[PDB]
């Protein structure tokens, strides 16, 4: 089919229904270990703008609590310019949000994304793109994998260890002929707790648009962009799709 986008664009309308059933996939809680808190308000909007078919990701920023520094409260997210695929995604560099206010103390905690599949470990593409950029900047960054399957969604947070960084770094090119060396043991289950008390917000691109699946011809994966506070757009928002309107 040539008009793939239509079905999906109609389909992902009801993503808010998939939020009527959410699973907090958390294992044994350890007091000594650090723990991440996720705002519900971010999950709401981040999901209801995503897609049933194409993968989408964003960066997460937060900071230590006062009463216990080991508790990492995610405070905000960043939708960078990207070009998604099914199961995989081409996202850009770490945001340059030094310009914006309240950016003093906003610690990059990792990233968060939809999952077309339903695994219990970081995927080779995930380990790859995670190892890219994050490896030689901060190995303490985490990966929040969200099962976006129809009917209901599920959140699972993972912490990539040296094996995936080394394997990913050695994998200088996402070779379709490799897919070897990675193992379910590369990732540590990081406790992720969902909270509706804490509230978070979005940092969007200056030009509003963040999805370049229709603007891919001009998409620069490796470039610097200026950002701003605001409210995100849907994956198949009319601004993401200039092409279709001018085709008359």
């Amino acid at each position: 089919s040539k008009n793939e986008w239509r079905k999906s664009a109609i389909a992902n309308t009801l993503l808010y229904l998939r939020l009527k059933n959410i699973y907090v996939s958390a294992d044994d809680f350890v007091e000594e270990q650090n723990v991440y808190v996720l705002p519900k308000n971010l999950l709401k909007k981040f999901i209801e703008i995503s897609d049933v078919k194409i993968q989408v990701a964003a960066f997460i920023y937060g900071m230590s609590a006062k009463d216990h520094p080991k508790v990492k409260e995610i405070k905000t997210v960043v939708l960078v310019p990207q070009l998604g695929h099914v199961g995989s995604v081409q996202i850009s560099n770490i945001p340059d949000i030094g310009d914006l206010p309240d950016t003093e103390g906003l610690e990059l905690l990792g990233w968060i994304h939809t999952q077309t599949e339903e695994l219990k470990f970081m995927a080779a593409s995930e380990v790859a793109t995670h190892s890219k950029l994050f490896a030689d900047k901060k190995r303490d960054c985490i990966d929040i994998s969200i099962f976006s399957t129809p009917g209901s969604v599920s959140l699972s947070a993972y912490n990539l260890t040296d094996e995936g960084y080394q394997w990913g770094e050695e994998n200088k090119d996402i070779m379709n002929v490799l897919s070897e060396g990675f193992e379910p043991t590369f990732s540590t289950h990081a406790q992720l707790l969902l909270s509706d008390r804490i509230t978070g917000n979005f940092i969007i691109p200056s030009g509003n648009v963040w999805n370049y699946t229709f603007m891919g011809t001009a998409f620069n994966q490796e470039g610097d962009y200026n950002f701003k506070y605001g409210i995100p757009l849907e994956f198949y928002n009319e601004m993401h799709r200039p092409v279709h309107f001018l085709q008359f």
Binding site: T13, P101, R197, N201, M239, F245, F248
Partner: protein, 1565 residues
């Protein structure tokens, strides 16, 4: 329960209630192969028994109302009606045949209406308090009549207008016109919407053209209007001149009883009185075949085209569709080329075919190039205007022998012809998704172009129709078609509208409402046709009306339009009902929108929701169209889940097609898409309003842009340069395909970069101007937590573009929307109105949001404040709010309730002489409580007691104690001047001679006098600034520290802006003095109810034991406050409903011996409301003076102000600022005597506390030219107003506050829970800091912070660091804030040479400018302005102008539209205000009024008070001017002095030295 379907007429298009038709003799039927020709001869001329009025027989003032006519006389129809139509003023109904010259008939009545406003001797006409309205079926005819009524009545000076009903903003400026011509719907919407009720009373003439539409689908509207007129008259008692123009049809009888027409006005004319007798011929086609009917019509047409033309005259032909006119033209052209082409060629080849071949030969571009040369015409609604003009001009001049045209010609241009022919008749109607026969009105209107009165002896009409129609069009054209009501069809809608207006609250209201409908009368006249079961029992149709009313009302109930208690009979309109009525939407659609529209709704669903509307009920998806549609549906830009064989999809497709402005070949598709894009606007607007009222973000956000796309034919993906009517064609397409963000083009601040961006030098210079003319703004805002549960938002906005009137128009509205983190829920919304003269002039705005209980406990990250243009693309700009972290104030602690007291007496006072002061042996309840700590204790003491409880008497005790103990000098502080003025006149009558004391007040205008007054008196009264002006040099003035008692009355105003900041500074100083000089001072603070008094107490060094603070609900008497919210008033003073409400409450109060006092925004309003009182009272039962009509006459002879004559004469007292002393005495004393229970008070006179039994507050908004909008009342003003309530003994004091929706919550919130007192001190830091530096009190940076520790600001900034902009909530952060604050201030001070910082600890010392500032008490910025403006070359004028710019004048009023008065004065005064500064500023007003003062020019009542206010603040300002000048060694100082004299004696220093002498008039001089 009733079936509405059963009641409406089932006969469809044929409302033929009688198959039996009657023809006149002479008519006959001729049978022909393809058709039957049934023809009727032209009617005989009538024999009138009246002589016609000659054009010159008319009155003088109207001779030009009738042109130098060809006959110079009224025709029979126009002559018979003349009596009642011109000399009488009776309502009437004139039913007359085709083309009766309605214009003149209207003009007669118009001229009559003009009579009783024309002044007796004055040869001029009051064009005020007088309006007239003309209702016509279609907009075309409306425009035609506007044209025919504009130049026709120009000589009277009257302005006419087409009611721009396509703009709800263009209904404010419409008031300059007297003659309104419009459609029924625009008028219905206009009259229905309450905001326009203000100007409805003004109308006194209503002409309804083509009333016979009552039988048509539009009828219910006309019926609704007429019903509206005779329904909510209420106070009015006068019904406008009701005049109806009709065609001759039966049931004219009933229309009479409908329109209230007596026989003296009821007229009826038959075909005989036609100005040009019209012959009839009916062609009845007999074909069974489809195509063969095309030739049936064509052959029958050609038969009649050739028939008529062969008889030497012209013809006109109407077609059923659009392009059909050219398809018919081609057929006829070829049919003659086949044969004759001689009769249509020319009437003289030598003098007609010339022009036909020469100038009448075509220059125009369409195919008409060939057609026009055959002697034929085509008036298609779609040709170029010029083509149409040059085309019709050919038929007019006799060249073209046949004109084929669309229906539109019958409505617009008046182009008569001898013979008219109707082809087709069966026409398509998208509303029904099918075909129907041509409507009667269209037929009549078309025949309205038959014949030529002056040229022809007879005209002729010919119709081509099917034999199935035959009798119908005959019944139309021979007085058989009945006029039946269609009201039922929309009854539910018109009922809803009335319920919204508040005109219906129970069934019987609707029952009575229905009595003014045509339906009602026609049901009475004929129950068997409207299917009434029982008129036998009900004969008046009461029961039936009740049933019907309930039957509709419960539908409105179940659809959530209105709320209805079926059993107990009570009705209440809801939001949906208001939206339904005010946006003119059908109930069904509203229901659909209500039920289908989710909060989660996204773009794709909205189109489907749109499609499901009642307006698209019958949208049939014809298979013929299926192919062409599917081609679009496949490639639509917005997904459509509906299948190709489904109406919803068709509608969606066609709308989305319209948004891309596509072309269709099929008529069927085109008519439909036309209809769609026609109704889409109001439908979408309704949807938007709905989504907004529900507080749903994305739906409204999207829908707005959708409405914009709906009107602008463009998607958000297109560039807004497209939106300009004057724009570069080739440039935009290069931008649309650039992938470049559009917003990036705006900051191209040069035509070069523009030229680069668009790839063109030529067009760069053009588009550059458009970018600089594109609506764009820059905004910034912050959050301010008043209290835990309340967050205040403060915004500052600048509009940045060049107002090119040509495109922008008079106004640019903007949607302001405060929303949550997600952008889902809407927290607050408002509409900002950007006018020309506010652009570039950035300004501020603020509003209240009660913090979400969720967020109140857990701080959210940020809110979003978005601003978007209502009609301009990509103007949208949004920003976050607060975010950076805030500490909400801790929830208020409890007040201090009062334990039981029937205690304290005058005998607890030591001296018996003191007991004779208070008189009333008992002490007031709340007053008695604090006695011990006031009369006995010598401690610092605070009393916060509700205003009206008696603090005034409390103040006296402190003095009595201070006196009996022989302490020393006593200072009474109070910003309320009136109270000081009274207290001086009061105290020395009760206190002076009882213990040897001298009491005297103070005029700050002379500090030197005041100092001596201080020294020379035992106790004194002063305002805060007045005494502060002395205290600000306590170091030197010994008699300051000699003080021991200071009373601080109404201290609550230490937050009341700058004067309050000074007030704070004063007591702060006195504390600082008590400290630094060790000798303690007693502070007695008296205030009204406060929040956390603790800070205020600790601040003033109060003994925490005696810092009493009671709540508002602690009143010694009972107060019952009413508050009512009204819609669409938050941006104006008040409205009619509030006025009515107020007077009802007032008169009702007066009826029970409880006199009422009404507060209004201004004198103007008082006068208007006085007149309103006179009309209101003089039309009802309660209407008295409240006293004898005889005994009161003498006081009418006290007219020291004429304005108060006739109003007060009828029992309404007035009070305003600037009132003469005698007047105020008289009126107030008369009020107290009970001579009038209705008191009207200007807000300004809140100071004149005329306490009463019941108080009313009419409006809470007052306009200010400073912020360029309406400003709302605040807690203090309103409270001071409220305090005036004390019912006679047992009676409860009653308060009525009328306001807007946006304010009611706030008022009810803060009137019961007093608002926190914050410090304004932060704004006057430069002044106080500089002053403290001046006296060498503060010498080092540290000493600044040291000084700050004594202020309320310092103690209050710690308990709410959020409010004051503190960067860090921590105390550390606060100290940092103070440090940074002081540092910035000191740098700012040294920047303009106010101080000098001697470096190293460092030491600071005052300099000239600052020393001046501190010496005279002038604001830092005023000094700065003066220094950089005064020069050694400056003259007297320049010094005046420089003076007028002082900051101290910002407190001077700037009334709405006063500029107009200032322009009038500027022509009487020689000195010219520099043109390079805004004349919308107060400096202009000051500059002119000071001249007016110098010229002793006669001024208005407002300007003189403004003048007094201005003059008050001049003396210590001119001294600053001259002292600035004399410091630099500029001799020009001697000028500024010469100015100073003029200011004191009120005269130019150029006049006779004797003019400055009192009362030396010109005679003496």
């Amino acid at each position: 329960v009733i079936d509405l379907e059963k009641i409406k007429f089932d006969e469809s298009s044929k409302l033929m209630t009688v198959t039996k038709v009657s023809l006149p003799e002479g008519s006959f039927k001729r049978v022909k192969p393809q058709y039957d020709e049934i023809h009727i001869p032209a009617p005989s001329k009538p024999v009138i028994d009246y002589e016609l009025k000659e054009i010159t027989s008319l009155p003088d003032w109207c001779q030009e109302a009738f042109p130098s006519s060809e006959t110079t006389s009224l025709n029979p129809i126009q002559s018979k009606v003349f009596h009642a139509a011109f000399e009488g003023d009776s309502n009437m109904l004139i039913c007359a045949p085709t083309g009766s010259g309605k214009t003149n008939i209207a003009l007669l009545t118009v001229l009559k209406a003009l009579s009783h406003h024309y002044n007796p001797k004055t040869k001029k006409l009051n064009l005020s308090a007088f309006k007239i309205v003309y209702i016509a079926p279609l907009k075309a005819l409306v425009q035609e009549q506007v044209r025919e009524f504009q130049r026709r009545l120009a000589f009277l000076g009257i302005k006419v207008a087409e009611l721009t009903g396509d703009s709800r903003l263009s209904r404010k400026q419409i008031d300059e016109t007297q003659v309104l011509v419009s459609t029924p719907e625009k008028w219905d919407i206009t009259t229905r919407n309450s905001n326009n009720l203000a100007i409805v009373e003004l109308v006194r003439l209503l002409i309804i053209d083509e009333i016979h539409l009552l039988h048509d689908d539009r009828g219910p509207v006309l019926e609704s209007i007429v019903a509206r007129t005779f329904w909510a008259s209420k106070y009015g008692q006068e019904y406008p001149r009701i005049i109806g123009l009709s065609a001759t049809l039966p049931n004219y009888e009933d229309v009479g009883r409908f329109l209230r027409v007596p026989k003296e006005g009821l007229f009826y004319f038959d075909s005989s009185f036609r100005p040009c007798p019209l012959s009839q011929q009916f062609c009845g086609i007999k074909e069974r075949n489809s195509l063969k009917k095309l030739k049936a019509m064509n052959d029958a047409c050609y038969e009649k085209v050739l028939e008529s033309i062969n008889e030497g005259n012209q013809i006109i032909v109407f077609v059923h569709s659009r392009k059909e006119t050219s398809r018919t033209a081609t057929w006829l052209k070829n049919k003659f080329a086949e044969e004759n082409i001689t009769h249509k060629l020319t009437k003289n080849d030598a003098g007609s075919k010339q022009i036909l071949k020469t100038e009448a030969a075509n220059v125009l571009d369409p195919s008409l190039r060939k057609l026009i040369e055959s002697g034929i015409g085509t008036h298609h609604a779609g040709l170029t205007r010029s083509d149409r003009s040059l085309s019709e001009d050919l038929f007019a001049d006799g060249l073209l022998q046949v004109l084929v045209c669309t229906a539109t010609l019958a409505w617009g241009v008046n182009l008569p012809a001898h013979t008219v022919i109707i082809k087709g008749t069966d026409v398509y109607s998208p509303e029904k998704g099918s075909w129907e026969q041509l409507s009667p009105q269209d037929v009549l209107q078309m025949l309205g172009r038959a014949g030529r009165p002056r040229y022809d002896t007879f005209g002729e009409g010919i119709i081509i129709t099917d034999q199935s129609n035959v009798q119908y069009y005959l019944s139309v054209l021979n007085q058989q078609l009945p006029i039946e009501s269609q009201f039922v069809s929309k009854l539910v809608d018109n009922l809803n509208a009335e319920v919204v207006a508040g005109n219906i609250k129970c069934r019987n209201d609707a029952v009575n409402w229905l009595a003014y409908t045509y339906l009602y009368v026609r049901m009475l006249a004929s129950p068997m046709l409207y299917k009434v079961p029982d008129i036998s029992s009900d004969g008046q149709l009461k029961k039936f009306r009740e049933s019907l009313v309930h039957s509709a009302l419960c539908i409105l109930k179940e659809q959530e339009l209105v709320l209805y208690d079926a059993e107990n009979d009570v009705i209440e309109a809801t939001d949906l009902g208001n939206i339904a009525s005010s946006f003119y939407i059908n109930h069904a659609s509203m229901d659909v929108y209500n039920r289908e529209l989710d909060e989660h709704t996204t773009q794709i669903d909205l189109f489907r929701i749109f499609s499901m509307s009642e307006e698209f009920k019958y949208v049939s998806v014809r298979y013929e169209e299926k192919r062409e549609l599917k081609q679009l549906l496949e490639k639509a830009p917005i997904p459509i889940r509906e299948d190709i064989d489904d109406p919803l999809a068709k509608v969606n497709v066609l709308l989305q097609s319209y948004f891309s402005q596509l072309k269709f070949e099929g008529f069927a598709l085109n008519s439909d898409i036309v209809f769609i894009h026609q109704n889409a606007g109001r439908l979408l607007r309704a949807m938007f309003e709905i989504c907004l009222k529900r507080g749903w973000g994305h739906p409204t956000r999207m829908l707005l842009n959708l409405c914009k796309s709906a009107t602008t034919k463009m998607w958000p993906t297109n560039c807004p340069l497209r939106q300009f009517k004057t724009c570069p064609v080739e440039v935009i397409k290069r931008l649309e395909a650039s992938t470049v963000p559009w917003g990036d083009y705006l900051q191209l601040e040069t035509p070069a970069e523009v030229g680069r961006a668009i790839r063109s030098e030529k067009y760069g210079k053009q588009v550059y101007d458009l970018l600089k003319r594109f609506p764009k703004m820059s905004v910034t805002c912050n959050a301010q937590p008043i209290t835990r549960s309340v967050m205040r938002f403060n915004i500052e906005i600048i509009a940045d573009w060049i107002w090119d009137m040509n495109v922008h128009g008079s106004l640019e509205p903007f949607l302001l929307m405060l929303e949550d983190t997600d952008g889902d829920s809407i927290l607050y919304y408002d509409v900002l109105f950007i006018t020309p003269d506010i652009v570039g002039h950035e300004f501020t705005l603020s509003f209240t949001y009660e913090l979400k209980q969720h967020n109140q406990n857990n701080l959210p990250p940020n809110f979003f404040l978005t601003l978007i243009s209502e009609n301009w693309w990509h103007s949208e700009f949004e920003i976050p709010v607060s975010f950076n972290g805030f500490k909400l104030p801790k929830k208020f602690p409890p007040p201090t309730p009062l334990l039981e007291n029937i205690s304290i007496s005058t005998s607890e006072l030591g001296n018996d002489d003191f007991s004779e002061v208070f008189e009333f042996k008992t002490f007031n309840k709340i007053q008695s409580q604090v006695f011990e700590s006031l009369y006995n204790s010598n401690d610092s003491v605070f009393v916060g007691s509700g205003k009206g409880t008696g603090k005034t008497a409390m103040a006296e005790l402190a003095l009595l104690n201070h006196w009996r103990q022989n302490k020393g000098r006593a200072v009474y502080i109070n910003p309320s001047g009136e109270k000081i003025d009274f207290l001086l006149s009061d105290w020395n009558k009760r206190f002076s001679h009882l213990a040897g004391g001298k009491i005297i007040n103070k005029l700050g205008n002379d500090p030197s006098l005041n100092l001596k007054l201080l020294a020379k008196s035992h106790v004194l009264l002063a305002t805060p600034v007045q005494f502060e002006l002395l205290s600000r040099r306590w170091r030197q003035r010994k008699n300051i520290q000699s003080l021991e008692l200071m009373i601080y009355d109404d201290a609550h105003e230490i937050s009341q802006g700058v004067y309050g900041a000074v007030y704070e500074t004063l007591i702060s100083r006195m504390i600082f003095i008590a400290t630094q000089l060790e000798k303690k001072i007693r502070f007695v603070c008296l205030s009204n109810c406060l929040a956390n008094a603790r800070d205020f107490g600790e601040w003033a060094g109060m003994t925490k034991s005696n810092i009493y603070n009671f709540s508002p609900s602690e009143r010694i008497e009972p107060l019952e406050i009413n508050i009512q919210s009204f819609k669409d008033v938050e941006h104006i003073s008040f409205n009619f409903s509030m006025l009515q409400m107020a007077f009802e409450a007032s008169a009702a109060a007066a009826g029970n011996r409880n006199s009422s006092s009404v507060f209004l925004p201004s004198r103007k309003d008082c006068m208007e409301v006085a007149s309103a009182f006179m009309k209101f009272s003089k039309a009802i039962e309660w209407d008295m003076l409240n006293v004898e009509e005889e005994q009161i006459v003498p006081y009418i002879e006290k007219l020291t102000d004429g304005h108060l004559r006739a109003p007060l004469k009828h029992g309404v007292g007035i009070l305003y600022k600037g009132m003469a002393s005698n007047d105020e005495r008289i009126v107030k004393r008369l009020y107290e005597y009970g001579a009038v229970s209705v008191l009207l008070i200007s807000k300004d006179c809140s100071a004149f506390a005329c306490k009463t039994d019941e108080v009313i507050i009419l409006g809470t908004n007052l306009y200010d030219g400073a912020e360029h909008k309406y400003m709302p009342y605040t807690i203090n003003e309103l409270l001071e107003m409220v305090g005036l309530a004390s019912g006679n003994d047992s009676m409860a004091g009653k308060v009525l506050i009328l306001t807007s929706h946006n304010m009611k919550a706030y008022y009810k919130k803060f009137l019961i829970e007093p608002l926190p007192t914050e410090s304004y001190l932060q704004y006057i830091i430069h002044d106080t800091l500089n002053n403290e530096i001046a006296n060498s009190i503060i010498q080092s940076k540290q000493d600044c912070v040291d000084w700050f520790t004594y202020s309320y600001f310092y103690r209050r900034i710690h308990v709410n660091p959020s409010y004051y902009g503190v960067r860090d909530t921590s105390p550390h952060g606060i100290s940092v804030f103070l440090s940074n604050l002081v540092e910035t201030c000191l740098n700012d001070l040294v920047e303009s040479s106010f101080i000098e910082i001697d470096d190293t600890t460092e030491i600071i010392s005052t300099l000239s400018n600052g020393l001046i500032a501190s010496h005279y008490g002038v604001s830092f910025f005023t000094i700065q302005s003066f220094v950089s403006s005064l020069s050694n070359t400056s003259t007297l004028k320049n010094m005046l102008y420089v003076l007028s710019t002082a900051v101290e004048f910002e407190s001077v009023p700037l009334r709405k539209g006063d500029r107009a008065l200032l322009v009038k004065l500027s022509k009487r005064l020689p000195l010219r205000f520099p043109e390079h500064t805004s004349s919308g500023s107060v400096s202009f007003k000051v500059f002119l009024l000071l001249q007016a003062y110098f010229s002793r020019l006669e001024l208005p009542v407002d300007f003189q008070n403004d003048l007094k206010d201005i003059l008050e603040k001049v003396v210590p300002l001119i001294n600053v001017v001259v002292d600035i000048l004399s410091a630099n060694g500029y001799l020009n100082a001697t000028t500024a002095m010469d100015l100073a004299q003029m200011l004191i004696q009120g005269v130019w220093d150029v006049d006779n030295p004797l003019r400055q002498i009192p009362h030396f008039n010109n005679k003496i001089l």
